[PDB]
Amino acid sequence: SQTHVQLNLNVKHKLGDVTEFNRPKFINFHATINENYWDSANKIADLRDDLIRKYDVYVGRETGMIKTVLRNVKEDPERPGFADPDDLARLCSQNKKRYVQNTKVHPYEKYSNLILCNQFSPFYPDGTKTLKGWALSQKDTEDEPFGTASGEFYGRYIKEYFGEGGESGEPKPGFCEVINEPLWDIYDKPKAPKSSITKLFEFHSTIAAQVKKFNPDMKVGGYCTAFPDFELQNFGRWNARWKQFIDIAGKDMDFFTIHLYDFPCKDGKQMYRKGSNMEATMDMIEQYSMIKLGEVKPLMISEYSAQTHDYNRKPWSPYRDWLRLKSTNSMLMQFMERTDNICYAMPFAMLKSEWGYNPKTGLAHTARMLRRENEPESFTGEYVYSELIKFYQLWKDVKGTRVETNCDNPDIMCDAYVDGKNVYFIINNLDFKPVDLNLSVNGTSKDAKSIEVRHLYLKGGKDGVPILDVYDAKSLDHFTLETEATCVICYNFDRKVKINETMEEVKYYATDYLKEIAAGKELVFNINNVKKTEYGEAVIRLGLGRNHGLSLLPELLVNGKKVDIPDNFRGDVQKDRASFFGVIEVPVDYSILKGNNTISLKFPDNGGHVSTVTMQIFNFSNNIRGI
Ligand SMILES: [Ca+2]
Ligand SMILES: [Ca+2]
Ligand SMILES: [Ca+2]
């Protein structure tokens, strides 16, 4: 076959309160406006003007400055294991004054909404000494619960260092994550001590309270999961970690935070989160949050992209950047589908990291926006853009009101945004081969005045180069989207595009989750208080975590009526992964749904779990399909 992709530019796609592309939320990177790196060693004279203003790119996230203050602050004489309030204020006040004097950056504050976070040590109270020769208190009583001193430091740090902008000081962070990737240091890294997981989650509650004692309106979140791999140990990992975190600390967090990395080359193997896998990870967090807390917590993805194991001890290459680009684009498309429940998604790329270069090995930082002119041959010359800039060039100008798009291949993701006379049409390929697309654009009488095509793909296969092919077109009824590629098609119209209909997406959750599968035994899920309109469509989302060999085509009954499951689902079959974990998206005849709904699953074999059953309802303002 060939793939049909349809854009209905007169139909607004509403999800919760969101109807627009949020550039600050999505088009950003892991940096700050006041990094030293901006103003020296670069081929471009005013790099902030080029990267931040011209491309319209937002920031950021920063752990270094708070780490430095913590490691050099005097111990409290009146209390052992606590930072001294007067010296903390002193050091924080030195930094503030330096920010106050740094007037070149004050006009860039409007591009900045800081995610603040602590690196694991010395902040976690495990006894690790600071450079001043003392550890943070490891007490755990009802009067001084675990992390009280850590929390007081964090709380004080925020109150003392930050101002309101410009000559009053650096603006307060929009978000304060508790601690970076804590279970990686605690339990999973080689030679990890395996201290209490439970105590890490209590730690979060105690940090939040301490932070709010000094800054009552500051948002706090956790636990900043390095590797959210819920299906492991037959869902024991879920049970021991995210489940317990939600039970213990969920109610005290203003937001939840995780990291999501694809593994496109780990010992020659390809293990992806892009596609059905990350959908299952995110559905599970939301569904259990609904069951236990009665709400979906806003989700932050403070780092995402690919981790490139096989290339991480290699010099920089365009190819290594490509591996990151393809993961970033697909993940961003998936985050955009949940925009109402994502507060922030940040691709992991730093500006430069001149100090992350190791002179012994000759290895530069593996995710940089800028690299030296003579890399890979030598680490010399002035800094120029890496290939990672291609993401920000690809997404340039994209903004406006979201409009409905659909596609008959679940390995092809699409979306679109309308800004006055311009329309941005974004298409992403999850499949590992080229896909020939037929494009239809409906809802306008008049043809576009011009068309610009941006196509980001890999030339030359393995160890090749990414290309960003930008060209003008008078017509584009067909288009070949390359392997794992993305295109952004910008239509320019003579008159303002008229949006006169609305498709409202609403996501419904089940009463229960996480059910063992036994052959021949019905698993029944209940989704209630569903609101329908005369015209609509719907999708049922089956979260399945099963060993390979086991069936991903159960008999499905919705309110006693039979619904077919398609062969093809979103993304890959997960061959190199240890087991299958993913959401199979099932279209369902809208006429079958009602207020309370019975979803019944029967598999022919034993083992594994149905992690979640959720449902997307799409309610139309009119008969937009013409049925
Ligand atoms: Ca996990
Ligand atoms: Ca759609
Ligand atoms: Ca597929």
How is residue 439 written in tokens?
């494009």
**Catalytic residue list contains 164:** no
Report how far residue 618's alpha carbon sits from residue 15's, in angstroms, rounded to the nearest whole number: 10
The b/e string for 81-104 (b: 16+ C-beta within 10 A; e otherwise) is bbbbbebbbebbeebbeebeeeee
CB 227 within 8 A of CB 578: no
Distance (Å) from CA 417 to ligand 2 centroid: 12
> In whole angstroms, what is the distance from residue 383 CA to residue 375 CA?
10
CA–CA separation, 371 and 406 (whole Å): 39
Q: Which of 127, 255, 126 is CA-nearest to residue 183? A: 126
Distance 332 CA to ligand 2 centre (A): 15
**Residue 126 CB: number of other CB atoms within 10 A?**
15
To the nearest 10 degrees (0 to 180), the angle between helices 64-72 and 85-101 is: 140
Centroid of chain to Cα 366: 19
Q: Which ligand is nearest to the CA of 406?
A: 2
Whole-number Å distance, alpha carbon 404 to ligand 2 midpoint, is 6
Q: Give yes or no: 78 in active site.
A: no
How far is it, in rounded angstroms, from Cα 144 to Cα 131?
24
The two structure tokens encoding residue 626: 């013409």
Exposure pattern of 420-429 as b/e (b: 16+ CB <10 Å)?
eebbbbbbbb
Query: Method used for this model?
Result: X-ray
What angle in degrees, to the nearest 10, is found between the helix axes of 148-161 and 197-214?
A: 40
Contacts of 97 (CB under 8 A, 6+ apart): none
Nearest ligand to the CA atom of 569: 3
Distance from residue 162's CA to the centre of ligand 2 (Å): 42
CA–CA distances in Å: residue 33 to residues 48, 51, 556: 8, 11, 52
Cα 487 from Cα 468, distance rounded (Å): 9
Q: For the chain, how many residues are written? A: 627
- Cα 130 to the center of its chain, rounded Å: 32
Q: Which two tokens mark 485?
A: 């590629």
Residues with Cβ within 8 Å of residue 3, at least 6 apart in sequence: 407, 408, 409, 412, 435, 436, 437, 438
CA distances (Å), origin 34, targets 23, 110, 112, 307, 420:
21, 13, 10, 27, 34
Cα(448)–Cα(324) distance, rounded to whole angstroms?
A: 33
Give yes or no for a contact between 55 and 42, defined as CB atoms under 8 angstroms apart: no
Which DSSP string do the residues of 31-76 spell out, in sequence order? --TT-GGGGSSBSSSSHHIIIIIITT-BEEEE-HHHHHHHHHSPBP
Q: Are 240 and 197 in contact (CB under 8 A)?
A: yes
- What is the spatial order of strands in the sheet that 523-527 belongs to? 523-527, 597-602, 555-558, 561-562
Per-residue b/e over 524-535, b at no fewer than 16 CB within 10 Å? ebebeeeeeeeb
β-bridge mates for residue 536, sequence order = 619
Ligand nearest 431 Cα, by number? 3
Alpha-carbon span 224 to 222, nearest angstrom: 5
How far is ligand 1, taken at its centre, from the CA of residue 282, in Å?
Answer: 12
The second-level CATH assignment, the architecture, of 503-627 is Sandwich (2.60)
| d(CA 535, ligand 2 centre) in Å | 16
Q: Which ligand has an atom closest to residue 187 CA?
A: 1
Kindly give the distance from the C-alpha atom of residue 224 to the centroid of ligand 1, in angstroms, as a whole number. Answer: 10
d(C-alpha 29, C-alpha 60), whole Å:
6
DSSP string, 544-609: EEE-TTS-S--EEEETTEE-PPPS--SS---TTSSSEEEEEEEE--GGG--SSEEEEEE-SS---E
- What is the sign, positive or negative, of the torsion defined by CA atoms of 431, 432, 435, 440? positive
Residues β-bridged to residue 417: 402, 424
Scanning the structure block, which residue is given the tokens 């890496």? 386
DSSP string, 508-519: EE-S---EE--T
d(CA 260, CA 127): 30
75, 152, 177, 303: the active-site residue: 303
Domain definitions of the chain by residue range: 1-21+400-502, 22-399, 503-627
C-alpha 527/C-alpha 615 separation (Å) is 8
N- to C-terminal Cα separation, the chain = 24
Strands 255-266 and 112-116: unpaired
Instruction: State in Å: Cα 539 to ligand 3 middle.
Output: 16
**CA gap 186, 189 in Å, rounded:** 8
Quote the ligand 2 centre to 119 CA distance (angstroms).
38
**Backbone Cα Rg of the chain:** 25
Specify burial of residue 156 (Cβ count, 10 A radius: 0-12, 13-18, 19+): buried
Token pair for 320: 């290594």
Q: Using alpha carbons only, what angle is made at residue 152 by residues 147 and 157, rounded to the nearest 5 degrees? A: 130
How far apart CA 333 and CA 407 sit, in angstroms, is: 14
- Amino acid of residue 120: F
CA 113, 119, 120, 121 torsion-angle sign: negative
Q: What is the 3-state secondary structure (H, E, C) of 384-446?
A: EECCCHHHHHHCCCCCCEEEEEEECCCCEEEEEEEECCEEEEEEEECCCCCEEEEEEEECCCC
CA–CA–CA angle 349, 350, 352 (5° rounding) = 130
111, 31 in Cβ contact below 8 A? no
- 469 in Cβ contact with 457 (< 8 Å): yes
Query: 99 is written with which tokens?
Result: 């920010």
Dihedral sign from CA coordinates of 429, 433, 434, 438: negative
Four-residue CA torsion sign, 617, 623, 626, 627:
positive
The H or E element that residue 161 is part of is helix 148-161
Cβ-contact 158, 116 below 8 angstroms: yes
Q: Residue 541 corresponds to which tokens in the numbers above?
A: 């989302």
Tokens 């790196």 sit on residue: 37
| Helix, strand, coil percent values for the chain (each to nearest 5) | 25, 30, 40
Query: Can you point out the beta strands (E) in 460-522?
Result: 465-473, 478-481, 486-492, 501-509, 515-516
Ligand nearest to the CA of 405: 2
Structure tokens at 237: 């990992």
Please tell me the number of Cα atoms within 13 Å of 420 on its side-chain side.
3
Ligand closest to Cα of 275 equals: 3
Instruction: State whether residue 286 is helix, strand or coil.
Output: helix
CB-CB neighbours of 178 under 10 Å: 29
Q: How far is the CA of 578 from the centre of ligand 3 (A)?
A: 18
C-alpha to C-alpha distance for 420 and 388, rounded to whole angstroms: 29
Compute the distance from residue 227 Cα to the ligand 1 centre, in Å.
6
The rounded Å distance from CA 242 to ligand 1 centre is 6
| CA of 226, nearest ligand number | 1
Residues 7 and 9: their CA atoms lie apart, in Å, by: 6
Nearest to 128 by CA among 85, 191, 71, 76: 71
Q: Which ligand is nearest to the CA of 568?
A: 3
d(CA 421, CA 277): 37
Given in angstroms, what resolution was this structure solved at? 2.3
Distance of CA 432 from the midpoint of ligand 3 (Å): 10
Contact 539, 524 (CB under 8 A): no
Strand partners, 610: 515, 544
Q: Position 328: which residue type?
A: T
Catalytic residue among 62, 75, 160, 181: 181
**Angle, CA 61 vertex, CA 58 and CA 66 arms, to 5°:** 145
Which token pair is 372? Answer: 């030296």
Distance 226 CA to ligand 1 centre (A): 8
Q: Phi and psi (nearest 5°) for 330? A: -65, -45
DSSP state of 28: B
